Amino acid sequence: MKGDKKVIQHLNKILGNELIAINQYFLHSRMWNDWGLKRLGAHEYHESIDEMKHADKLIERILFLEGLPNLQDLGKLLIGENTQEMLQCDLNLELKATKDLREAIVHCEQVHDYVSRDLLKDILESEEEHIDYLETQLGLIQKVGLENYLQSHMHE
Amino acid sequence: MKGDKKVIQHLNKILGNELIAINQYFLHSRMWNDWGLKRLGAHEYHESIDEMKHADKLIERILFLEGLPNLQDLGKLLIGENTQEMLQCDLNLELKATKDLREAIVHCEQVHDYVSRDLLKDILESEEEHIDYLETQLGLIQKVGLENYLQSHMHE
Amino acid sequence: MKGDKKVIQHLNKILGNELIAINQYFLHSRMWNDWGLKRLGAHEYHESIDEMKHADKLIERILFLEGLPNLQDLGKLLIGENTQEMLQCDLNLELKATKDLREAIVHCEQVHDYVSRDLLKDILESEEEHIDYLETQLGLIQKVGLENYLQSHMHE
Amino acid sequence: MKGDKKVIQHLNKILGNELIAINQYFLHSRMWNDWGLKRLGAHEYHESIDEMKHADKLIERILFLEGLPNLQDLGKLLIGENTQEMLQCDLNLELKATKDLREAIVHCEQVHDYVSRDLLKDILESEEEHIDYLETQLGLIQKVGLENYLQSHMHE
Amino acid sequence: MKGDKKVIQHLNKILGNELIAINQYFLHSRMWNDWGLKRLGAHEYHESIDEMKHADKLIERILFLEGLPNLQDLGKLLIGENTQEMLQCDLNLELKATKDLREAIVHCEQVHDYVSRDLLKDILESEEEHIDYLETQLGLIQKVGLENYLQSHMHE
Amino acid sequence: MKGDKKVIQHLNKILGNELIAINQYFLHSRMWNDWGLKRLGAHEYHESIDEMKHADKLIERILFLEGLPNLQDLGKLLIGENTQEMLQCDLNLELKATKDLREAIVHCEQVHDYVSRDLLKDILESEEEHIDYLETQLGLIQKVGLENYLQSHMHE
Amino acid sequence: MKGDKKVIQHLNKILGNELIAINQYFLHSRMWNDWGLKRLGAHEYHESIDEMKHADKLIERILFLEGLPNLQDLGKLLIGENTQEMLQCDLNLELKATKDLREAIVHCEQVHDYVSRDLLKDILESEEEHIDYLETQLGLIQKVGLENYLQSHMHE
Ligand code: HEM
Ligand code: HEM
Ligand code: HEM
Ligand code: HEM
Ligand SMILES: O=C1NC(=O)c2c(NCCCc3cc(O)cc(Cl)c3)cccc21
Ligand SMILES: O=C1NC(=O)c2c(NCCCc3cc(O)cc(Cl)c3)cccc21
Ligand SMILES: O=C1NC(=O)c2c(NCCCc3cc(O)cc(Cl)c3)cccc21
Ligand SMILES: O=C1NC(=O)c2c(NCCCc3cc(O)cc(Cl)c3)cccc21
Ligand SMILES: [K+]
């Protein structure tokens, strides 16, 4: 089906963000696992898988709209050097992702691509859940202290 | 069955306390969940449900006695701004509630409304169990430290 | 996540309508049960539970958006003195509630809070189902007569 | 297999009656459900499905006989404005359908299309069962009164 | 519940498209079955059922909004004389249907009938899935050749 | 455990190849699915998953050896424009991948990193199986013809 | 099958390291159990069992090669006086063991005893997994503090 060219551009921008998130979350997961913080590693693994599923749906939508999905361009990963920074790097990426999702939904609504809007809204709901998770973890570090926070994330 | 007017007034006073407790505990529960203290959130949710069941039985009793249940007037919620304050606000409310239950039981006894007395005694038993829980939590905070106490209430 | 202040105000306005509905439907349910109209009592109970679940989701969303949920201010209950009035009071409340929901959705859309919109849309779907039920009940009273209508709601 | 041209015209006339009946019963069903008369709504839905199955078999036979099934021409639906009129409208349509079935069977017999006759006889048995149902409902309205009749059709 | 007059007109236009689709897809299905192309027959049958379910929901929504569903007016069916034409006829109908859905969604949005919009968005998702299927089939005919394409659709 | 710096560099080069392969195979899979060649799409999907698992093991090994896995640098994807080109592009990437694996194993052996060698040997066995598959597909296209080959890959 | 004499000498050296490891890990396990750190005790017990199984395979290989397995000479156990030291003593033993495994593999390769090499490679894989575990435990002590680390290892 011949899609709106600018919708396809927005879908590729969202996909670009997902590709960053896949790799950033996967690396964070395996760093946490290496450090013995296996509950964080498993949770971050599932975040990465969730972003892979989002990327799959975006690729499929772009192709249906007769666009070319961009899996070639990879923006800057935000990694960081300890648990607090890794969480804040994830949160910075998510806030950028949700900004782009909202701008994409505006445009889908304006050109009447209501199915693309529904897909992006579903993705945004997942990203807002991730934001809730991250903000909560950063708050917990403050409430229980870093030592206890990390302790509580050693065992799955 | 025509009830004693003052019994019905006592029952509506107890009901008023329950309506405060339902909302205060439900809000406390959701604040704790939002902060990632899900064991506290879950326990406080069950306390709110318990008060909902008490309120149901009082409403049913008032109607049987041919009175009008007062679900319109809501007294002051005691919310507080951190875990210790929230627990103490709950405890303050409970101690007011048990005082009111005792005065109502005295009056039921005097006018021979033994079934209303039995209902209020059952509610009083539940409220004293709540008081036991709350006093114990406040004492645990002192014994294990706030950070450990919160850590232990992160996961269900 | 820092929410739009007016979104939060709208969500609290919706929450305020739910708190009225919880109590109005609960009291109606227990009145109908006391009168032996247990099918009405049970259906109205489930309506009250529905509104409790809506209020829960609203409270959770307001807290995520870093607002304060208002569980303190309870507006006017619309009770009524017989079955037809009780149903009409529920319907008047629902029509106010759906008006407020639509206005809230407009503002969510305007500020790009698409997740709050989706939550409100889901609540609106539930409220329109309640309106369908209420309008149908009122029409059935006209078609079968009040005595038959009440007869048909004695038993579950 | 090359069918008799006039047999095919008869099958298309029967099919045309079925297409009217599908829509008329389906709309009646959904009207009754909307009014809270869900036992009538469910029964009328099953009448509509029955006519759909008849239409399928007619379409399949016409194609086997190398004719063109006519799904384009829709005759006048008989809707009516209350339960008694809706039942009478269905019955009027059914009596027209059974007259047309009888004439089609005569013709099938004359040209020795005994398999088409057997199909039409099966459909005629179904339609006489519908007529029995409709005549019985109209008679019940007279015997129990309209308010009781409708009351008995509120719940499935 | 009193619906918006122009929403009801849009819903009846959508329903009119569905009534065309139901019959067009049903006839196409039975033509393919008659020709021994049973996998196409089965798939097209399920498409027809899908449109029947959409029409049911539209009819129910129109009646809830106190409008009259139009099951009387049947537009032009697009049939076609061979497999390629039949698929292109379905695709032409679907492209008209999605245009009309998008215009109806615009109008529901403007009058704040967000529940009608959600229903129409769900129907639109289904129709874009049909378009995906149709465009894919027409493309497969080009890649594998007509004779192989038909061969692959003989057996369910 | 402090690894050999040049081993870690080899492992990061292998990982780099895997990241290309993940995206190339995933896009190919979704292109084939979009075109209705679902058997090719499913097989290529599982190839993508295989490379994801290889990348996981490489990341875990690099981190164990106290290196930094490179998920930032993405080399050129080889995307075909038709099935035969897509298969040849996969094959060209695989032949580069196995050359790099062999050179990495030579170096692992020279510095006695026998566990890293064992990991790479396992990956190489997988890649030779992929090469076997790809060479076999390209051969089949020649033996059965492209139209038949594509026909055989329509259905899962 | 008469083996290479220096292979057998290497296998006996590896066996000697395993006999030290068996006893050192078993004593550490029972020390941790005595101290109430039963999760550490259980994990170290399973490490001891692992080394017992390695020793068994070495004994079997040496006998097959017509050598005499040396179970008589026991080198110095590295015990240590607290958890951190005990883990470090285990890590120091493991690093000597893997050095010895690497030299043994070099010699097996030179004299073409590829089966002995494969056995040692499998043992080396196990020992590198132990090193991972130990390094991670030492890292966790730094990140969560010793008191939390030991707390998390009290219960299995
Ligand atoms: C374009 C980028 C990627 C896409 C579209 C993608 C897509 C997917 C999908 C759809 C799944 C199946 C998830 C499920 O249904 O449970 C999956 C699984 C997985 N992915 Fe990815 N992925 C991508 C990149 C990566 C990368 C870079 C890695 C690691 C470096 C990775 C590691 C994994 C793993 C380990 C699994 C689970 C496999 C299993 O054991 O079943 N993925 N991926
Ligand atoms: C007049 C005030 C209320 C009364 C009499 C009442 C009564 C009840 C009762 C009898 C139940 C069934 C519990 C059970 O038996 O398992 C219930 C459930 C529940 N209530 Fe309330 N309630 C009140 C107010 C509220 C409020 C204000 C909220 C939220 C703000 C709320 C949230 C809930 C929830 C989430 C459930 C569980 C529903 C489910 O999933 O089953 N209630 N309530
Ligand atoms: C040419 C006209 C039609 C034909 C030939 C037709 C045929 C059929 C058939 C063969 C079935 C399967 C019944 C079974 O064996 O269980 C069916 C189901 C159904 N039809 Fe139709 N139909 C027609 C028109 C319609 C219309 C106009 C509507 C709505 C206005 C409708 C609504 C339904 C529904 C709701 C179902 C059941 C779907 C389910 O089971 O979930 N049909 N139809
Ligand atoms: C301090 C000396 C040792 C101690 C205290 C010890 C202790 C144990 C214990 C408690 C078990 C588990 C028994 C069971 O399954 O119920 C076990 C199993 C075993 N041990 Fe030892 N052991 C020692 C030395 C050795 C040595 C020197 C060897 C071989 C050279 C060996 C080989 C084995 C084997 C093969 C098993 C069976 C484990 C399995 O496959 O499940 N052990 N040992
Ligand atoms: O692809 C990428 N791989 C990376 O490692 C990486 C980056 N690393 C910065 C240091 C992270 C770190 C800190 C630490 O204390 C321990 C460890 Cl293991 C790692 C930055 C951008 C992109 C990439
Ligand atoms: O909280 C509230 N409790 C109430 O009763 C109530 C109200 N009652 C109005 C009369 C309803 C009634 C009529 C009847 O015949 C029998 C019964 Cl039991 C009750 C109005 C506003 C608010 C409230
Ligand atoms: O209905 C009510 N809703 C309320 O919030 C509330 C009150 N809140 C005072 C501050 C509570 C708070 C502190 C905090 O540190 C974080 C959060 Cl989320 C909330 C007081 C009386 C009645 C009500
Ligand atoms: O209701 C309708 N019934 C119809 O047949 C029909 C139409 N037929 C067009 C001829 C296509 C055909 C070609 C063929 O080779 C075999 C067959 Cl059976 C049919 C056109 C519009 C509307 C209708
Ligand atoms: K602790």
Curated annotation (Swiss-Prot), chains A, B, C, D, E, F, G:
What further fact does the record state?
Answer: The unstable catalytic diiron-binding site within each subunit (Fe1 and Fe2, ferroxidase center) also serves as a pore for iron uptake; the ferroxidase center is labile. In the iron-loaded BRF crystal structure additional stably-bound iron ions are seen inside close to the ferroxidase pore. Mutagenesis of residues reveals other stably bound Fe cations in the interior of the BFR shell; they may represent a pathway followed by Fe(3+) to the central iron storage core.
Q: How many cofactor units bind, and how?
A: Each BfrB homodimer binds 1 heme group coordinated by an axial ligand from each subunit.
GO CC, one annotated term: ferritin complex
Is-annotated flag, keyword Ion transport?
yes
The biological processes this protein is annotated with in GO are: intracellular iron ion homeostasis; iron ion transport
Cite the InterPro entries for this sequence.
Bacterioferritin, Ferritin-like, Ferritin-like_diiron, Ferritin-like_SF, Ferritin_DPS_dom
CDD domains registered for this protein in UniProt: Bacterioferritin
The record's EC number reads: 1.16.3.1
Effect seen on changing residue 85 to A:
Assembles into normal BFR with wild-type ability to oxidize Fe(2+) and store Fe(3+), 5.5-fold decrease in rate of iron release from BRF, greatly reduced affinity for Bfd
In Swiss-Prot or TrEMBL terms, this protein is called Bacterioferritin BfrB
Q: Which cofactor does it need?
A: heme b
Write down the species: Pseudomonas aeruginosa (strain ATCC 15692 / DSM 22644 / CIP 104116 / JCM 14847 / LMG 12228 / 1C / PRS 101 / PAO1)
Q: Which GO terms describe its molecular function?
A: ferric iron binding; ferroxidase activity; heme binding; iron ion binding; iron ion sequestering activity
Q: Which gene encodes it?
A: bfrB
Use in biotech reads: Small molecules designed to bind BfrB at the Bfd binding site (derivatives of 4-aminoisoindoline-1,3-dione) cause cell death in model biofilms, and are bacteriostatic in planktonic cells, suggesting these compounds are potential antibiotics. Model biofilms were tested in strains PAO1, PA_1081725 and PA_1076058.
Reactions catalysed, as given in the entry: 4 Fe(2+) + O2 + 4 H(+) = 4 Fe(3+) + 2 H2O; Fe(2+)(in) = Fe(2+)(out)
Q: Give the lineage.
A: Bacteria, Pseudomonadati, Pseudomonadota, Gammaproteobacteria, Pseudomonadales
Q: What does this protein do?
A: The major iron-storage protein, part of the heterooligomeric bacterioferritin (BFR) complex. The ferroxidase center binds Fe(2+), oxidizes it using dioxygen to Fe(3+), and participates in the subsequent Fe(3+) oxide mineral core formation within the central cavity of the BFR protein shell. Can store up to 600 iron atoms per bacterioferritin protein molecule.
